[PDB]
Every structure is written in C-alpha cells, then in structure tokens.
Nucleic acid binder design. Structure first.
Ligand SMILES: [Ca+2]
Ligand SMILES: [Ca+2]
Length: 47
RNA sequence: GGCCAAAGGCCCUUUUCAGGGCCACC
C-alpha cells in the first residue's frame, strides 16, 4: 500500500473529478504512474 | 497464495469519453 502524500492526493483528485460528473481504482495501491492513469481513463468511461 | 483488470519510468492539464510533456527503448 502507497503512503506518499503527493501520490495519494493526486490520485484522490482524479477520483474527485470522476465522482463529480453526471453519470474505481484503489488509491492505496502500489502502481506505476501509467498503470494508475490507465485505470482512471477506462473508469472515466463510463461512468 | 496465486487468477483477471491497468501497466516502459516519471510529470502537467478539467480539451477530462480528452489534450500535452520529459526520459528510456534506435
Ligand atoms: Ca493486460
Ligand atoms: Ca512495471
């Protein structure tokens, strides 16, 4: 599990953006940047 | 434990069903 406050807060932000839409990746997980970015993309559609 | 999803490493953006950058892999 991830603990770095910069990674957590950015991940939380991508999520916030998501559950702010009209219409889910675990932020506490160990993942490369491309990996987490990939899941958020897919998840954002749709959602 | 592993079985699937995502995934080169890292970074920026509400163009966010998306756009962009560094580095590496000739
Ligand atoms: Ca795959
Ligand atoms: Ca990897």
């Amino acid at each position: 599990t991830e603990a770095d406050p910069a990674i957590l807060s950015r991940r939380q932000k991508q999520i916030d953006y998501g559950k702010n839409t009209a219409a889910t990746p675990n932020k506490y997980g160990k993942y490369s940047r491309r990996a987490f970015d990939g899941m958020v993309k897919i998840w954002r559609k749709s959602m």
